[PDB]
């Protein structure tokens with residue numbers, strides 16, 4: 001066994017090794033291994049992406065106008081976010097400016113995704129780490145009603161309703177066909193909600209599974225379908241016609257009425273179901289404000305997102321702030337430049353890829369995606385991994401760093417960046433939220449904090465949906481209908497050689513697509529995706545990524561039941577298809 | 582009464598098919614899971630992880646050997662000894678073969694499982710291979726699309742539960758009910774196609790009147806799916822209705838049929 005020091009952690013692979021493969025209730029394929037000491041405390045954590053498809057390779061030789069459709073298929077969970085990054089990147093390379101309505105609609109698409117992706121994560125993915133579903137069977141329906149009504153004005157709270165939900169769960173379980181609940185961690189000492197709260201949460205899990213389907217109707221109006229809506233380089237394809245012949249063939253007042261109806265319902269659900277549930281999880285699980293800190297008190301990164309001035313990606317335009325903090329120095333939020341070769345670099349010395357020199361990091365404009373499955377000395381064989389060898393190559397995920405620093409990205413990262421840039425709304429919201437839980441600010445920098453920030457962001461995004469919709473309606477009232485710029489649609493109008501960067505904040509964090517065009521075709525296309533940052537393997541200095549750091553130092557009650565590991569990993573909302581692409 | 586056991590596994594995929602499934606408007610995915618089937622294994626939704634998840638998989642395929650439906654999303658890569666997709670430390674293809682062996686029938690959800698989809702597009706770095714090229718001794722129903730329509734997925738499920746039989750299929754294994762006709766055979770813009778009324782560039786006067794998208798590269802004329810009739814997301818829209826031509830996403834090899842914006846070459 002070996003031991004070394006990095007980022008204030010002691011990485012020690014002595015002691016019992018635990019393996020969790022597959023990681024479930026994530027998107028895609030992940031393996032996690034840890035070592036635990038004699039006190040059942042994690043002294044080593046190993047994050048492994050167990051899939052690869054090679055979109056960066058597939059994109060070579062494609063028409064830049066087609067790229068968004070290919071890269072959208074990086075992920076069907078954060079569906080649309082790669083298409084947005086792609087059209088931004090191609091427009092940046094070619095020198096295309098889109099009309100205001102196109103930008104507004106794109107912002108709507110992204111805010112819709114944030115609302116949907118965050119809501120479903122909270123209930124369908126992370127929910128069962130916090131809610132003991134089987135324990136809901138012991139709840140008193142009247143006490144459940146009283147609890148729900150004490151937390152929220154949400155209408156659906158009658159004793160009869162909770163009794164009906166409980167009875168349906170009873171009948172579901174009674175025949176022994178437990179489906180998704182089979183062989184779960186129910187009864188684990190870390191489940192701390194009373195039975196009434198478990199029934200309330202389970203009822204809401206079902207309500208959210210039903211309701212999420214409605215949110216994406218906004219993507220269907222503007223983008224044709226969800227998952228995987230359509231886009232164009234130059235704007236959006238959803239031509240608008242309000243008051244002219246043929247409005248039946250376009251985005252018209254009836255289509256806009258539908259969108260408005262969805263926005264209102266989405267805000268209602270997030271504000272009155274998700275938000276109180278998140279705060280309730282906080283109230284009953286305060287020790288988790290001190291677990292899973294990882295890099296969140298050291299290094300956090302946001303590119304920023306939601307440009308409110310069309311075609312302006314500067315600080316004054318982006319509604320969601322960008323910046324970087326390193327070395328725990330939150331008094332100095334640093335500017336980020338995605339073209340600077342000394343800023344974003346990816347290392348592969350611990351990943352399954354070939355570089356000419358694996359001891360150096362490559363900026364994505366110099367990126368290489370040459371897969372090389374080489375696990376070295378596992379316990380087992382090349383096709384039977386019993387234990388990954390984290391001293392060599394152990395993942396399909398590349399290792400991104402910012403100025404050589406390992407960074408956390410995502411809702412907690414963004415919240416910290418906005419807070420410390422002095423965003424008045426963020427400061428007010430965060431302060432009020434931590435006050436309600438009687439926790440210090442530092443309590444946000446934790447597994448519990450990731451979940452709270454995600455809920456906060458869903459609420460923020462639902463509000464922004466109305467803001468963007470009102471912006472769109474204002475343009476229409478002023479007779480501004482344009483949704484596409486086609487001046488540079490034809491390849492004959494393009495520079496022979498150009499490159500561009502498209503960036504945004506996907507639900508899970510900082511997303512960038514770097515594209516180089518030559519002779520009308522994609523010459524290079526490199527993606528660095530939020531889960532690539534968070535699920536990163538180690539670098540040449542042995543520095544650990546966000547997941548590995550968040551797992552470090554964690555006490556497990558029952559080693560063979562990895563509930564604490566799942567809680568912390570799920571708090572980041574891992575998307576492994578995104579991470580590996 | 583007991584519900585039919587369903588094991589849902591995932592190879593190389595983006596998860597769009599699982600996401601489409603939960604968009605179902607009728608029956609709601611909630612009601613499918615609670616009342617119509619027993620979804621006994623599913624990496625994206627199940628409580629159990631790691632060894633607990635392995636135990637569920639093993640127990641279900643053993644106890645219900647010959648009696649469960651296998652749902653597959655994504656596909657096996659043959660490159661790097663199958664280690665482009667790793668499950669429980671071993672090639673995904675081993676899990677696929679074990680699950681397929683005990684299944685009564687297999688549902689290949691989406692273009693990935695049916696044909697290959699994006700990872701199989703040129704140059705196919707991982708040698709991603711559709712299910713029917715690996716599993717050759719089992720009924721496989723192909724339900725292609727990237728992803729398939731939510732209410733088509735749930736209709737196919739309810740058909741099988743209600744009628745206690747597999748749907749009748751075309752020569753490619755696609756259900757006739759939803760894949761028997763072309764997008765272009767039921768497209769509400771066909772009047773414009775026939776009149777030679779075409780969008781020529783984005784957001785032109787033609788686009789604002791909902792003219793035909795053929796000259797913008799619509800692949801509707803060569804694509805079989807239900808999008809132009811059943812539509813998407815509780816009948817709200819479909820690609821063409823919202824102004825973009827069909828990409829051809831339900832058809833084998835659609836990524837490598839030239840640019841999405843190049844016109845269909847030979848209209849059948």
Ligand code: SF4
Pocket residue numbers: 764765766768769770771772774792793794795799800801802821826827
């Ligand atoms: S070419 Fe496309 S838009 Fe035109 S009628 Fe056919 S399916 Fe519809």
Ligand code: FCO
Pocket residue numbers: 075078081082506507508509511529530531532575578579
């Ligand atoms: N959110 C999201 Fe998916 C990841 N990681 C992207 O981009």
Ligand code: F3S
Pocket residue numbers: 225726727764804805806808809819820821826827828829830831
């Ligand atoms: S792109 Fe696919 S979703 Fe339907 S309209 Fe064409 S088959």
Ligand SMILES: [Cl-]
Pocket residue numbers: 692696697698699701832833834835836
């Ligand atoms: Cl294909």
Ligand SMILES: [Li+]
Pocket residue numbers: 388389390391
């Ligand atoms: Li080792």
Ligand SMILES: [Mg+2]
Pocket residue numbers: 056398526527528529581
């Ligand atoms: Mg990459």
Ligand code: 3NI
Pocket residue numbers: 027074075076077078079575576577578
């Ligand atoms: Ni994703």
